[PDB]
């Protein structure tokens, strides 16, 4: 599993469950092409987005639909979504964990990259 | 000044100086129309981006060129840029400050909305 | 003003107003000697804590009463307080800003050290 | 395992390995009594600090020795340590994960609390 995402809720102190996200990859004509999508599980994790063979070098974008998450809790948040954009596998295959910590008016994102 | 940006550097504990950013407004065709841009000052701040008359309700994207900032310091970063996408809504008088705290493999962004 | 504190609220996207804090300096017997205190202003800031003459090298602790802040808003928090412990070292002229970003189950703290 | 700690390094995008920490519990005479200690593993995690029977209601403090971590990497950081203080098990037994994301001049801490 070369690309995993983990989402936490800073207001409830819990994993952020059922958060939708879409992954895009920048194509040669400079447009974002759909690559994968899913929702976080009861542990706030989304696994199995791609495989090592499919996850080639490129620029990738992960859009995390945080607005729908907060709205379903009755909160009207600041951000439309959290956006994480990065170059992947530029120096060979790696495993990427993208983490996001969510509050209504603030979020953080970090990456753990292992070889 | 209805919209200001502040950028900080969590590695050196200083304002992030000379950071370039563009602001976009979402159009009817779901494309990003460039709206404003600048570089942060010696205090890590960017003012004068828009006016009250021009800053109408809509979805806005602030794209912060964090990769060039870290490259200038000789540090290999994870993200291509830091992206802040938000819905601007007229709920009374409101001035927006977007803050971003930068590390090579992590960033946080917060909004302070005051009257 | 060699030492200032700024406190923000990540749930409401506003300065954290009326937050109490104490500052301690570590003594020779490893006890915490109270040094200064105050409450944050309408801008979420606390100034005037110390002077250059008094703010000597040493280890300092800023203890921010975040629990009472969330309790006043009717929100059950995780932390008893937010604690910032740091070594102050004379490396040229230096003014310290301690920032803290608060959520019910999470906090971040940053230092901006400038000349 | 009712108390686990996870530490990440925001500069290298990796778990923070070999980070020491000490856990204290506030005694009836208002002093901090030693409770448990350990170092994070190759995955940045510290497990097996306590058991459900030993981990009674009380106020607990986790001191994470971040200064020694950065110093061993050649960085001179701002903070002496990261301090997390909280009331545990006030409404019955819970499982606590304390997470810390570290940069030289900034850190965040979050708690995931499950039943
Ligand atoms: O608005 C201000 C003003 C001064 C400072 Cl120093 C930090 C912030 C915001 C901020 C604080 C923290 Cl603790 C983390 C990330 C942030 O953007
Ligand atoms: O990956 C995990 C798994 C469990 C937990 Cl509890 C926190 C993180 C990362 C994290 C920590 C902090 Cl302190 C802030 C934002 C984060 O994504
Ligand atoms: Ca309206
Ligand atoms: Ca000295």
Resolution (A): 1.9
Query: What is the CA(D57)–ligand 4 centre distance, in A?
Result: 43
Q: Report the C-alpha gap between A107 and A91 in whole angstroms.
A: 29
* Cα four-point dihedral sign A97, A98, A104, A106: positive
Sheet with B20-26: list strands edge to edge. A32-39, A20-26, A58-64, A79-88, B79-88, B58-64, B20-26, B32-39
What is the β-pairing status of strands D95-103 and D3-9?
parallel
Q: Report the C-alpha gap between A18 and A38 in whole angstroms.
A: 9
Q: Which of D86, B60, A79 is nearest to C76 (CA)?
A: D86
Cβ contact C39:C5 at 8 Å? no
Q: Which chain D residues contact residue B73 at CB under 8 A?
A: none
Q: Report the C-alpha gap between A3 and C9 in whole angstroms.
A: 32
Residue C67 is labelled as binding a ligand:
no
Q: Which of C106, C20, C93 is nearest to C63 (CA)?
A: C20
D1-115 architecture in CATH? Sandwich (2.60)
Please report the DSSP string for D44-79 in residue order. SEE--S--TTT--SEEEEEEE-HHHHHHHTT---SE
Q: Report the C-alpha gap between C45 and C30 in whole angstroms.
A: 29
Q: Which two tokens stand for residue C85?
A: 């412990």
Q: Report the C-alpha gap between A48 and A4 in whole angstroms.
A: 7
Count of Cβ atoms closer than 10 Å to residue A102 Cβ: 27
* Cα four-point dihedral sign D57, D58, D59, D64: negative
Q: Which of A1, A27, A21, A2 is nearest to A107 (CA)?
A: A21
H or E element, residue B69: helix B66-72
Cβ contact A104:C13 at 8 Å? yes
Residue B73's alpha-carbon distances to A10, C103, D59, D81, in angstroms, are: 32, 32, 43, 26
> Counting Cβ atoms within 10 Å, is residue A27 exposed (0-12), middle (13-18) or buried (19+)?
exposed
Q: Report the C-alpha gap between B17 and D26 in whole angstroms.
A: 44
Write C99-102 long-range contacts (CB < 8 A, 24+). C99/C5, C99/C6, C99/C7, C99/C8, C100/C5, C100/C6, C100/C7, C100/C8, C100/C64, C101/A106, C101/B108, C101/B110, C101/C8, C101/C10, C102/C7, C102/C8, C102/C9, C102/C10, C102/C11, C102/C16, C102/C66, C102/C69, C102/C70
**Domain residue spans of chain C:** 1-115
Q: Report the C-alpha gap between C17 and C44 in whole angstroms.
A: 5
Q: Which two tokens stand for residue D43?
A: 């995955």
C87, β-bridge pairs: C59
A3, β-bridge pairs: A96
Q: Which chain B residues contact residue D12 at CB under 8 A?
A: 104-105
Q: How many residues comprise chain B?
A: 115
Query: What is the CA(A52)–ligand 2 centre distance, in A?
Result: 25
Residue B37's alpha-carbon distances to A79, B16, B94, B114, in angstroms, are: 20, 16, 21, 23
Cβ contact D18:D112 at 8 Å? no
Q: Which of residues 85-104 of B touch C (CB under 8 A)?
A: 101
Cβ contact B8:C110 at 8 Å? yes
Q: Report the C-alpha gap between A97 and A88 in whole angstroms.
A: 12
Q: Which two tokens stand for residue D23?
A: 């856990």
Q: Report the C-alpha gap between C83 and C109 in whole angstroms.
A: 9
Residue C6 is labelled as binding a ligand:
yes
Q: How many residues comprise chain C?
A: 115
H or E element, residue A67: helix A66-72
What SS3 class is residue C100?
Answer: strand
**What totals of helices (H) and strands (E) does chain C contain, helices first?**
1, 9
What SS3 class is residue C65?
Answer: coil
Residue C33 is labelled as binding a ligand:
no
A64-77 burial by CB neighbour count: b if 16+ within 10 A, else e? bbbbebbeeeeeeb
Q: How many residues comprise chain D?
A: 115
- Touching C (3+ Cβ pairs <8 A), the chains are A, B, D
Q: Which residue minimizes the CA distance to atom 8 of ligand 2?
A: D99
- Alpha-helical regions (H) of chain C: 66-72
Any atom of ligand 2 within 6 Å of the Cβ of A10: no
* Cα four-point dihedral sign D86, D87, D91, D95: positive
């Amino acid at each position: 599993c070369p690309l995993m995402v983990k989402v936490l809720d800073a207001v409830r102190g819990s994993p952020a469950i059922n958060v939708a996200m879409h992954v895009f990859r920048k194509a040669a004509d400079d447009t974002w092409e759909p690559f994968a999508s899913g929702k976080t599980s009861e542990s706030g994790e989304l696994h199995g987005l791609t495989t090592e063979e499919e996850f080639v070098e490129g620029i990738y974008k992960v859009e995390i639909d945080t607005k729908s998450y907060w709205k379903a809790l009755g909160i009207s948040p600041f951000h439309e979504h959290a956006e994480v954009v990065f170059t992947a596998n530029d120096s060979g295959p790696r495993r990427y964990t993208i983490a996001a910590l969510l509050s209504p008016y603030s979020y953080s994102t970090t990456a753990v990259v292992t070889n």
